[PDB]
Amino acid sequence: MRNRREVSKLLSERVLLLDGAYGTEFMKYGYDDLPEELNIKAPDVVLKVHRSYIESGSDVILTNTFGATRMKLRKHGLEDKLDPIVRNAVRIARRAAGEKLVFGDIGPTGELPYPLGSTLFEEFYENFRETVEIMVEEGVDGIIFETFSDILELKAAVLAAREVSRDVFLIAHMTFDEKGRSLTGTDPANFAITFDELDIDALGINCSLGPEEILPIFQELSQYTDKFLVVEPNAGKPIVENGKTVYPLKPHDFAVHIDSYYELGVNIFGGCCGTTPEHVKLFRKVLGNRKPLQRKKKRIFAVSSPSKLVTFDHFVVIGERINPAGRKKLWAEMQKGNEEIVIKEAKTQVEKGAEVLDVNFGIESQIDVRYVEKIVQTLPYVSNVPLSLDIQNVDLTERALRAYPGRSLFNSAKVDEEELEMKINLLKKYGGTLIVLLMGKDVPKSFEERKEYFEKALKILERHDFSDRVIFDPGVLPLGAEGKPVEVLKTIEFISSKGFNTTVGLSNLSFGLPDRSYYNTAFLVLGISKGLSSAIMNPLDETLMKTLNATLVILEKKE
């Protein structure tokens, strides 16, 4: 009934109260069935629980659909009841809510993404799309993805939701353990930096921990996003009693935390497992009528994988090896769809110090798009690090970006209006950063020409508001082709002085001469001394890597 603009306006005016738990409430009514099944077998019980929260003051209630997606329902022999389960839930919740807000509630499938599990991004996406379609038809005021443990599954859920409706208010949540990490390794800063730039409306945290434990996790999340914030702690950390799970936190002890969350900018406050109507009644009295606080998010240039956030505040080694160029074996094996060869290359590079991996697929018309989609989804889990997606075709790029688990680095756009716009639009939609190569149709042959491309790039980036999401590659040319490297060093120094990160395709300097290792090392050292932030390079070049380390120590950037 209400769209995202209306909900956003309401949130800007006041902090809202969500509801408590459902799964932990149904047993008290004598129903221990799967919660979702009650929508068909005992809708009266579902209505009573919703009413219990509405009568306690909740401004928003969640539909009884946490496990209502085909992949999850299938595990309970209910996949064929998806439609009645979801439709009945929305109707029941609407009847209880009256004019209060009803958010469609979707939890994770319990299936890990390949290669941890067997599921590809495309299947999670279709799974969530079908449930969202039903909710939008039935009239929800928003959709909340609760309790997610993996960023790829959550990215698929939010992208599917946004494809169904550009108008529905969307909230994405992850649940974090006591160490502040999701099941597949994502910390709050990574979660916020990755999702803040997707077209969702709010981010939040629910479950796993109590209000005291979530506070620092919530604080970290709040510092990295300017989107609305939601929190639903369990009523204390789960503890086992005379047989099973109990949430011990009483109403007063839970409610005293509201102030601390309000100060961190919370927009919607509620409770998860263990929270009861008695808790919600007191939250209502304590919250009262408050206008949300303003926040200023920390700006940062970082890329991520599920378990690693790589911030460009130190020199970043980007492994160049997954590139079939001049590697006839690798080229052959990729055309046939070999994953294990590419996986071996990734792990060895990381072992030697690569913090990010460049991934290129040679003559793209020659490769199976499905293969690009699977490699892109796989490497961040098995090698642990973020990727620099080195792709030429716009269509293939879109496919790689939609399925990338984290915030990627996209390996390059030249300074060409059209090329930049297309790459930026894909990045704005799927998230990510961009390497901008300082050349146009032709290669520049001086510092001055490169500075002009830099300025033209800045004009274009300003126009699409994307200036904070780029790293500049001055364009290293082969020495044997009058590459004039002093001109590139000058450019690096200049870009660094302007506050922008830089990178170079290091090996291009020497790929046509003997002793290339020595030229690459000399140039790297010189480039770092001028401010070079990173480089796509061979991490298996021991001289190169050892001299790199020595340089960082000497320049006091590490020891």
Ligand SMILES: N[C@@H](CCS)C(=O)O
């Ligand atoms: N909204 C769900 C969350 C389960 S983690 C419930 O209250 O049961």
